[PDB]
Structure formats: structure tokens, C-alpha cells
A paper describes a structure:
Ca2+/calmodulin-dependent protein kinase II (CaMKII) is a Ser/Thr kinase that is particularly important in neuronal signaling and cardiac function. CaMKII has a unique architecture, in which the catalytic domains are linked flexibly to a hub domain, also called the association domain, which forms a dodecameric or tetradecameric assembly. We reported recently that the activation of CaMKII-α by ATP and Ca2+/CaM triggers the exchange of activated subunits between different holoenzyme assemblies. Our data are consistent with the idea that the CaM-binding element induces the hub to transition from a closed-ring form to a ring-opened lock-washer configuration, which can release or capture dimer units.
The role of peptide docking in destabilizing the hub emerged from structures of the hubs of two CaMKII isoforms, denoted CaMKII-A and CaMKII-B, present in the sea anemone Nematostella vectensis. N. vectensis, a member of the phylum Cnidaria, is an early branching metazoan. The sequence identity between the hub domains in the two N. vectensis CaMKII isoforms is 62%, and these are 55% and 53% identical to the hub domain of human CaMKII-α respectively. The hub domain of CaMKII-A crystallized at pH 7, while that of CaMKII-B crystallized at pH 4.2. To illustrate this distortion from planarity, we aligned the pH 4.2 N. vectensis CaMKII-B hub structure onto the pH 7.0 CaMKII-A hub structure by superimposing the four subunits that are furthest from the break (E, F, G, and H). We then illustrate the deviation between the two structures with arrows that indicate the displacement of Cα atoms from the flat closed-ring structure (pH 7.0) to the slightly spiral, ring-opened, structure (pH 4.2; the lengths of the arrows are scaled by a factor of 2 for clarity).
Author numbering:
A (entry chain G), B (entry chain D), G (entry chain B), H (entry chain B), K (entry chain G), L (entry chain D): 342 to 471
C (entry chain C), N (entry chain C): 342 to 405, 408 to 471
D (entry chain A), M (entry chain A): 342 to 405, 408 to 472
E (entry chain E), J (entry chain E): 342 to 472
F (entry chain F), I (entry chain F): 341 to 405, 408 to 471
């Protein structure tokens, strides 16, 4: 059944997004490939490879956010590409409130490619824009 | 072997990008799934599905010229996911010249997911950011 | 039957939006109530009533450029036998006669009511 | 009577707005469906679903300045026994620490459905000019 | 019988608004008092008196308009002050299109005081804001 | 010319009314302004609002809480009948901030008065500026 | 009587403003003292003396008028100073329409001092601003 | 004689300007008519009547003066209108220094109409601008 | 008070000099202004320039090539001696562009006159504005 | 003997400029006529008369300055008009530093008319521009 | 002798710069390696490989410049790296004049790496900034 | 073989970049020629020679911290010119976080020419652009 | 005589400036060294050498508006028999098609060397404030 | 001897520039003429004469931040036995006490004259 496999990718992507917002680099480093490639706003239009580029935010910005946030995932589409591969597409809304009573919402679009290596799904590439 | 698979994906992508810049929707529609999903600047942050969104450009803008353009593909990385699936990521430079001989270069980052369906490689999803 | 009703409202809505982009006021005036209420950017923050406010655009704008519309994440609330709500985002691709493309996005709520066995749009809310 | 039901929906909407402006989430969460859908400025052009998106503001800003709300030009569409839609403009008067007055205007559409004998708000659309 | 009087004030105002949009000064000058007082955006914050201030627009602006427009009257409230006096207030939406073809909507808020002088309803004072 | 006294009564009530506004005296204001008054004013954001609640909000949060001086210019009074009158005038408000810098604000005001039960009540007004 | 003299000063002023708008320098030069002083925006904060400074606009602007206008005199206040002197204070609204068809309104504040010299009323000083 | 009256109007004006700068409202209220009219920048293009509008600045600004100033009266011109009336026109330079120590100069143009009422000279109208 | 006539002569020459400037009459100007005149003026960019060449350039390229009116205000004349005088005044120049829009420009001028050979010559001047 | 008279006017002007920069009003008031006419940037385009206009700066600005400054006189030209009259013109550079420590240079152009009244040279008129 | 080799690199760089300013792609294509790498302002911060990226300007902008120009080469430093390799560094000033009488100067800094392949010096990499 | 030579250059460059970010001038001065030439943003478009220009940063800015930074090297291409010379070209991404937890990414493009002098590889020239 | 040589250099500089402003390259190229060095705004902060950089302007803009040049505060440093340096400010008056006047100021240093008995300008530095 | 003279002027010039960056007015006042003329940005387009104009900066600025100077493309015109001109660009690296570096560039001409057997700077021109 494929609908079961769509649910696992969604489950894993939720798990991955939770690890980013809570600064839990240990879960992140187990779900994302050590040779992950990516495009994202901080990569300044370059394809960057490796976890260290992202570990830098877990060390300095994600683990040190005092602000409360709420994340919403919109329109999750999962392409089951085979028995060992999948692609998930979704928009991500982050609500936040700063030192004042001033709230803001930010939107990102994300593509994440999951691959089954060993018997484990690992995110081998992602593209983020917003 | 792996290298040949990477070359096949790079060829398909080269031919896919060729059809776009040429305005050759006949080749585009054979390479891109009819239920393709995608993120691109013109989707305004939304995941749009289907070919009609892109066909709009083949019939009204990609048909148009005579501006000369040269396209350069940079740093293409191909993930071979399985026998039936692959992902390619690359940057795209477009050189152009407007009226009065002023040259500009534009850069796009692209993720294309490829899937073998019926023995044929089809682009089931892509993600573009400026 | 829950999904049948959803598809029926999505059909009517597609039909309505086509009538807007075509400039086909005959179809629009048959699907939209003569006493429709609405919020839209041109109403300038006011609730306006009646088709005339909208007929103005069919007569002086919409009947005059290629475009393509996309309806995103349509959700239909089935409200009973004779009522439904549909809400969606709408992307309008267009060109400026100079060869440049633009995409505009609007958010739409439309309330459908079955009056005399016919589905009519009695209220809609459009924002950007 | 149509007059009677129109008034019921207006009173449900006043009760709901009061719960929003006072930070009373228990009342809000009983009037708004757990799977509510909505468009509002903070949804950034998206259709968002569920209470959590709104509960975020009850927990982090709403339970905090004097204000007065006015409901302008309310129109209630009665849609059968168990459904109604109401649309109106909402004027919010407020004063900052500086004692400076300020009026904000929003336009709202709220779809109400009677579920389990209770009137629940299943979708709302909020915008500003 | 007050709802009778209200529908008459509304009809007169509609007739008045129509004479403005169409540039029919003959109908305007029969409905508006020759010594009408008014506040409006073109009066620059001043209470102006007399028709001559307004006739200036019928003879220059309100005539030369060939642009299509549609007028909507919103939230009309009529205060029936007595047998010989009434007051009406409303918002007025004006849609229009460019020669380029782009549309815009303008909003004004209008108060109009009507007095029965002789046997006719005359607009003796009006107030307009919003630009 | 028996009506010249009738225009002095309106002027006196209007001055009494504006006095109530600038001193924060809601009790006098509520006696002079109809409970179902309609109005346009800059703080209504272009909308016709009804009732005293909209205006009581300023008496409770801004007007009772800096030195000011108010001038009424070119007051014209229209006598419409035995039970109805209309007055229109411009209002200059001078003020000074904390820093000691002077400021003058101008508003145009139309006020409609109606005799109800032998008492002149302000049933509609329109303010711009 | 007091009100007749007010009416006279107002009449002279209306006559003077009419001469200004229609470019009629013959009437202006009979009503305005040859050694008139004045403050006006074109005097750049200076008190200017003589008719020549004003004749300049009659010969180059006021008579080259190619635009329709209407003038309104607001809240005229006359100070009857003596037998042979008066002062009038008023605001002047000028409505006009540009070449395209767009209307505008300008406001000026004016003080005019009138003196009866040789049995004839002459404007000996005026002060204009916006 | 003509020059003695000019000297008198100038003297009254200097006396009046001194009362303005030192916040001396007792002298101001004896020299300025209780029904004085005026145009000045704080009247927002309106002709305002009465002393109360001006008393406001004596009680809240002119008497709260905490800055040194010097006033110069430039090119005073007196029109002797009759026995009981005069008009004076002049420019007023006000030098001052801010809290830090930076000097500035402001210019105003003033017309003042004086009337002899009950044998005493009273300023019945004035027009100020910049 | 024999010197009051001496100040009228300076005034007459100055008016004659400014007349020569506005009419483009270099011949009169060159007779009234010293051949080794020194000056500050806005077109000298803050520098002291010497000689007539700098100013002849305007007579040849701008002043002889639009209607204008010139007003001289508050002319003060200083009589320094039998052979020397100084005059200072403000100058208002009104003009109108092609479009018909009016314009007024202000300049402050000091002019130093010296009797050389029984003839008053302008040996230094200073213009600002 | 004219070059003699020029060096004296230059010395007087240097004495005058020094009394300005140092805020010594006693020396200023002995060199500047009590009815001195002047044009300067603080006069806002007007010819002002009398010392009182300038004494205002000696008593507020030209005193309270503790900033270091250096003054340079450039291109001084002296017109010797006669025995009792002379004119001098020059550019004046003023350097100065902030409390922050940043330097700036300002330039003014100055004309000064000197008259021998009695047996003393008095500055009867001056013109300053450039700001 | 090395000073002779410095002169050949300078001679070749002059020859190369002449071919760019005159639009002579044929000389350019013989002096620059078909697998040349480069950084330059139009590469938008990317390393681009190949001649086609540059051929695009010869076809569209360099061969179609009507404007006259003068080139000046400042501070040419030549590093002789070996018998088959050299590096030359210099600043390049381009004077030009547009349709009007308006002249302008632009400055670029250039590094060019020359390699001896066969018996011919070819430019195998260049970096341009400005 | 070729690959080892490319690895040696990439190692030297890695060690060179390490010394810069660390502030370790002792290692920098051993890798960079004493007569090194260079173009960089801080040279304001000029070719500067010698180490003292760069030593200024080791003693006054690279010594400073405690801002965390991560550096990423992208697309390194190494030209092996001969036995005694090589050229490496790459892009450099620097992630950083200022006070208040705001992250920024900066990109630089770099050309470094390497020469074997006395059996030791020395960076004789480099070219940096932002 | 020092006065005599100072005058020679000033006249060489007037001749050179005249050749620049009239477009007379034959005269310029005989007064300016073929290996001249220079700083000027168009050199963009660089020391440029040779005539070609300047000949570019003779061929493409200079041979084209009335102008008057003034040399201000010339100072000549006599540096032995065969060398001198002169520094001065140059004011250029000009008029555009619109008949609008305009003054530009440059500061210049020119080093003159007697080579082959002829005075040649071997280096110049030009700036503007 | 042509190059010896060039190196002598480059030595003196380096020595002069060090005296500026050090705030060492004693050395500066020995290498620069008491009647030096100059153009520099602070002279505001004027030719100024004398050391006092420059002493102002030694007393209120230069004697108060780390910096490094670089002299670029120095060219010396040997003008005779007793005169030379040197022109060069000058880069001044500095920090703002907040940790940020800046580079400023100036273009300098300096005229050296041998008076009494000693080289003195009689004129200099500085622009940016």
C-alpha cells in the first residue's frame, strides 16, 4: 500500500520539522544525510553540501531562540518514487511574537527528498525558498 | 553503472531546459508529468499542480523572442534514488540583452525530481527559486 | 454524497470563475444572486449589495489580454441540503502587452445556496 | 421568524468577538470548530485550518489596553435550519500608552453551522483595506 | 407616516446625485437652495455659501467627463426632523475606469439637510468628506 | 425676525455641547446627544456609526485624561422648523505637547438638532478634518 | 451708518479682486495707491513698494490667463477705522481647472487697508499669504 | 506732525513686541483690542477673533520661555491713515539659540492696524506670516 | 546735511548701473565699473575674482539673450569721504518662464564707489543670494 | 604711501577677526560702529543695523565655544579709497573638531568697509556670505 | 631570461584585451582555453567554465558597440611561475563617450593565468572584478 | 598523479583559509609569499604587494571574536600548471551571527596562484571579490 | 628675475589651458610631455601616463558652447633653472542650450620642466571639491 | 644616479608620511616648508599657505587608533639637481573602535626642493 508510505514520509517530515524548531540537532543529524545537498535562503543561491552548514544554526540561532512559535504545514504533497525513495512538498508558516506584543508570520516553501538507506529513511536533499 | 544514470538524468534535464528556452511545448509535455507539482517564483509561494500553469508561458511568452539568451547550468548534482527515481539539483544562469544593448545575468536554483514511469523518465516535481 | 456535493460546488465555482475571466456576464448573472453581498478590494472595505457593482467591470474591463486561472486548495463546507461554502486561493497569470508575465493572488470565500433547486452565489469575500 | 434567527447569529458573533477581545479562549474554543478554516492577514494569503493557529494569539498576545468594538452593516444570510452566514465590518477603537486614539477596520465573513444543536463557526474570512 | 417621508427624501437625493453625475445643472439648481451652505473637500475646510461655487464644476469638470462611472449609495439613514425638515446621510462609492483601462473606487461621506420651503423639498446644507 | 432668538438657543446648546466634550463631561454630553445619534467623524474611518458607545469611549479613555483652547468660527444656524435646526461651524483646537511646542488642529462640523419632548437633542453630526 | 461703510469697503474689494482676476490693470491702478506697500508670497518676505511690482503680473500672467476660475470671498471683516480709513480682512478661495480637466482650490488670506484720499478710496497697503 | 505720529506707532509696536517676547500679558491685553482679529500661522488660514486665542500662548509658551532671544524690526513703514487710525508694516527677525548652543534666525512679516479708541491707541487687527 | 545730495548721486549711479545689467548694456557698465574691479558673487563660487572679463561673459552670452522687473529695497548709502562711498541694498528680480509661471529671486548687494579723476567708479562689489 | 595704509587695515581686520573668534566683545565694540550695517547669513538676507544683533552671539554662541579652531585669511585685497576710507575683502577658512573628534572646514567670504571717524578706523559696514 | 618571458605575457595580454574591445572573437577563441574558468561581474559570483558564456558578449554587445573607447592598463605585474605557466595582474581603465558629449571612465581589476599547451600560451583562467 | 596534486593544493588552501579565520599569522606568513600581490575589496581596486597589508588584519581584526563563524568552500577547481605551479579557484561562504542572534551569509570569490619555491608551495598571488 | 620666470610659467599655463578649451591638440601635444603623468577625476583615483588618455577627449568631446576661464591665486614655485611648479584654481564659466549659466571650479598643480630648451608639462594633478 | 635620486625622494616621502600617521609634528615641520602651499580636501578647494593649517590636525587629531599606510605606484620626476616631484596613491587601513576595518584612498603629488642642501616639501596636492 502506498497511502501507508505517504504517511511515514509525513510522519518523518513532521519529526524533522520539530527537531529544527526545538533546536534538537541530535534528531536532525539522524534524519538528514551527512552528505545532504540543499538550496536555502542562507545558502545565497548556492548548493551547499553537508550538515555543518546547518549545524551552525542549531548551535547559534535555533537553540538560542527565546521566542514562542507555532508552525503550520500547508498542502503536503508526497510523491512515492519507489520502494526506497520519496519526495514531499509543502508550505510552512511560522507564527511568532517578539519582545513586544508584535506578532508576525513567515512563509517558506520546502521540497524534501527522502531516501531509504539501510532500512532507514534519510533526507538526502532539500530546497527551501521564501 | 552510476555514472551513466547520472548522465541520462543530465541529458533529460538538458533536453528539458532546451524545450523551455526554445518554446517547444511538444517536448516539454512529454518530459513533464501531466500531474506535475511545482514551486516557482510565478506560483507566488504556492504549490501548483498540472501542466496548464506552465503551458501558459509556452503560448504567450516563451513563444516570444528575438532577445538572444545563453543558458549555463552550474554544479549539477544528481541523486540516484533507485532504479525508478532520481533527483537533480543545479543552478541556472541566463544571460540576456534587452533593447539598447544592455546585458543582464539572472540566476535560478532548481530541483527536479525524475521518475521512471512505463520505462520512460518523467519529471514529476520541480522547485525553482530566484 | 458528501463528496458528490463537494464536486458539484467545485463545478459551479469553476464555471463562475470562467465567466469572470471570459467577460461572460450572462453566465455570471445566472450563478450570482441579484442581491448578492460581497467584500472585495474595489469595495474599499464596504459590504456592497447587488450585481450592478460587478456588472460595471464586465462592461468596462473584463470584456477586453490572455490569462490563466488556477484554483488552489479548494475546501467545501457542506452546510445542509441547500447550502455550502467554498473557499480557495486563486492565481491569475497574465501578460502586460509588453511581453512580461505577472501572477496575482486572491483569497476567496463563496457561499452557495440552493434556491428553487438551483445553486446561487449569495455572498462572496475576496481579499489580496 | 427570519428576524429571530438573524438576531441569534448576530448575538453569537458578538459573543465570539467579545471572547477574542477579552482573551477568553474557553468561550472561543466552544464557538469555533476544531477543524475551522479561515483566511486572515496573519495567514499570509493561505487557507489555514484548526484552532492551534488562533490559540497561539490567545496564549501570547490577546490576554493583555482599552478597546471598544463596533459591528457595522451586519447582514445575515439564513441558509436553512442549521446554517447561516454573517458579514459585517468591525471597527476597533483603542488607546496606546501615549493616550493616542486609533481606529482599525476589518471586514469579516463568518459561516455558522448548527452541529449537535450548538451553533459553531466553521469558517471565517477576515481582511483589511 | 414617517417611512413615507423617508422614501421621498431618498428619491430626491437619488435625483440630486444623478443630476451631479450627469452634469444636469438645471435639476441641481431646483433641488439645491440658492443660498446653500456646504463643507466639501474642494472648499478646503471652509463653509461656502451659494450655488456659484458648485456651478463652476457643472460648467468645467462634471460636464467634460466621458469616463464611465457607477455610483453606489451605502447605509442611507434618514432623520425625519418634522413636517418641513429632514436629514439624510450616506456613503457614496464611485467606480470609474481610465482611458488606460484601470479601475478605481472612491468613497465620500455625505450629509444632506432637506427643508420644505413652500411646497418643495430643497437641500439647504450639505457636508462631504473623504475625498 | 422672531427666529433670531431660536438661532441663539442652538448656538448656546452647541457651545454647551462642545464645552462638555473638551472638559470630559459625559453627563452633559449624554443629555444633549441622542442615544441613537448617527455620525461621521475622522475616528469612524469613513463609516456611519450609531449610538453613544462609540463616543463614550473617548470620554472614558482620552478626554478626561494637557491645556487646550477651542475657538468656534463662522457658525451658521439653519432654522428648519418649530422642531428642527441645523448648525455648522469650524472648530480650532490649540494645544501644546510635553516639549512645549504649540499645535493647532482644524475640524469642520455639522450638527443637526431636533426638539423631542420640548428638549433640543443632537440627533446627527458630521465632522471632518 | 456703520453697515453702509462696511458694504462700501466690501464693494471696493470685490471690484479690486475682479480687476485682478480679469487682468484689468486700468481698474487696478485706479484703486491701488501708486505708493502702495505690500507683503505677498512673490515678495519673498519683503515689504515691496509701488505699483510696478504688481503691474508685472498684469502684463505677463494675469492677462495671459487661459484657465477658467471662480473666486469666493470668505468671512469678510471690515474695521471702520475713521471717516477716511478702513481695513478689510478676508479669505479668498480660487477654484480652477488645469489643461487635462482636474480641478483644484487655492486659499489665500488677505488684509487690505483703504484710505479715502481726495474723496476717493485707495488701497494703500495689503498683506497676502497662504 | 507726520513724523511724530510715525514715531508713536513705532513706539507702541516696540512696546507690543516687547510684551510678546517677555510673556507680559498685562501689557499685551491693554494694547490689543478684546475683539482683535488676526491672521497668523497658528490660525491655519483662518481669521480668528478675540484675545483668548493669543492668551493661550502667554499662559503656555511665551511665559514658559527658557531660551535667550533678540528681536529686530526691519524696514518699519507706518501709514498714518487719519487722526484715530494708523497701519504699520514691518519684518521681525528673531535670533535664538537651542539647548545645545546652535543659533538660528526666524523671519516674520507683520501688518498691525492701530485705532485710537477713547484717546488710547489699540491694535485692532494684525496679519502675521512667514 | 550737505551730504544728502552726495547720497542721491550714488543712488542714481547704482540705478544706472543695475539698469545697464538688466538691459545688457555693457558699454554703460564698463564705464561705471572699474577695469580692475574685485568681487564676490554666487557665480564666482566663493572666490574673489578680478577684472571685467568675468562679468562681460554674461553680457555676451546671457544678459542680452524673457520679461523681468527689478526692485531695489532698503538702499543704505554710507558716505566715507570726498572720494569714497558705499551703498548696500537688496534686489528683487521677478521673471516668468516659458510656461508662464512667475518667479522671484532675491540678492543682497554691497557696492563700493570711489571718485577717480572726478568720476565715480564701482571698484568692489559683493553679491549673495 | 598706500601700502602703509593697507597693512594697517589688515592689522585692524586681524584684530577684529580675533575679537570674534575669542568672544572679546570689548574689542569688537571699539572697532565696529554702533550703527554698523551688515549682510550676513544669520541676518536671513536682510540688511541689519546696530551692534545689538551681533552682541547676541558674543553673549551666547561666540563665548560658550570650547572647541579648538584655526582661522585662515585668504586672498586679502585692500582698496584704499582715500585718506579716511578703505575697503577690505577676503575669504576666511575656519577649521574645527568635534567632541567626537571629526574635523570640518567652513568658508565665508567677507567684505569690510573701514572709515576713519575722528582719528580711529571704524568698521561701518560688512557683508558676509557662504555659510 | 625571465624578463623576456614577462614581455611575452604582456604582449599576449595586450593582444587579448584588443580582441575583447574590437569584438574579434576569432582571436579571443584562439588565446582563451575552450575549458577556461573565470569569475567576472556577469557571472554573478559563480565560477563559469567554457567560452560560450563569453562568446555571448562578442555576438551581442562587444561587436555591436558604436561608442569609441580608449583602454589603459595600469600596474601590470607578471609572475613567472615556471617554463609553462605565468600569471598577470593589472587594472584596466576604459574611457568612453555616449550619444551625448558625456564621458565616463570605468575600472576593472583582472587576474589572468596563462599556460603553455603545445607550444602556445593560452589563458586558462581569469578573475575580473569592478 | 594529477588528483594528488589537486589534493595538495586544496589542503594548502584549506590550511591557508584556516589560518585566516583563526587569526594565526604565523601559519599565514609561511604559506603566503613575502612579496605577494593581491586584489581584494579592502585594496579599493588596487594591486597591493607585501604581507604588511594583510598582517594589519591579523593584529587588529582577525585577532578579534567571539562571533561564531562557519566557512564553506564551494566548487574548488584546481589548475595544475606545471611541476612548480598551480592555480585554485573557489567560492567562499561565511556564516556569522551578530549581537541579538541575527544570522547573515556572505560570499566571496577567490583565485589563488600557488608556486613551488624551494620545494615549498607558496601563494604568490590572490584575487578576491565580493 | 623671479618675477620674470613666474610670469613665463603662468603664460605657458594660459597657453596650455587655451589649447585644451579650444581643442587645439597640436599645441597641447607640444606643451605636454609624451610620457606625462597625471591625476584627474576621469583617471578614477589612478596615476595615468601618456598623451593617449587625454587625446581621447580632444578627439571625442573637446572640439565642440561658449566658455570663459579664470586663473585664481596662481603661485609659481621656481625650482632651479629648468623646473617650476604652478598651482592655481581654475574657474570655468559656461552656458548650456537653455541659456543657463554655470561655474565649475577645479584645483590644479602643474609641474613644468625645461627639456631641449622648451618648457614641457611633465605632471599635473587636477581635483574638484 | 637617476635611480639614487628616485630612492632618496621615496625615502623622504615615506619618512614624511610616517610623521603624519604618528602625529610627529617635529619631523613633519622639518621636512615641510614653513611657507608650503597645498591643495587638500580640508582646504575646501583653496590653495592654503603655511604649516599652521596642518599643525591644527597634528594638535587635535593625528596625536590620538591603529592604522597602516601603503604607497602605490610611486613615480618620481627628477627635475634637476635641486628639485623633484613624486606622485603616488596612498591607502590608509584603519579600524573604528567597534572592530570594523575601512580603507581610504588618496592621490598625492609632492614637490621637493633642495634648499641649503636639504630636501624640503614646498608644495603638495592631495585629492580623493
Amino acid at each position: 500500500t502506498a497511502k501507508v508510505r505517504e504517511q511515514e514520509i509525513i510522519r518523518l517530515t513532521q519529526k524533522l520539522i520539530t527537531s529544527i524548531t526545538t533546536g534538537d540537532y541530535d534528531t536532525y543529524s539522524k534524519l538528514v544525510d551527512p552528505h545532504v545537498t540543499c538550496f536555502e535562503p542562507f545558502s545565497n543561491g548556492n548548493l551547499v553540501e553537508g550538515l555543518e552548514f546547518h549545524k551552525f544554526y542549531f548551535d547559534n540561532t535555533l537553540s538560542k531562540r527565546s521566542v514562542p512559535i507555532n508552525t503550520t504545514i500547508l498542502s503536503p504533497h508526497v510523491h512515492v518514487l519507489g520502494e526506497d525513495a520519496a519526495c514531499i512538498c509543502y508550505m510552512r508558516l511560522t507564527q511568532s511574537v517578539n519582545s513586544s506584543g508584535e506578532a508576525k508570520t513567515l512563509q517558506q516553501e520546502e521540497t524534501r527528498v527522502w531516501q531509504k538507506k539501510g532500512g532507514n529513511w534519510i533526507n538526502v536533499h532539500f530546497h527551501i525558498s521564501g
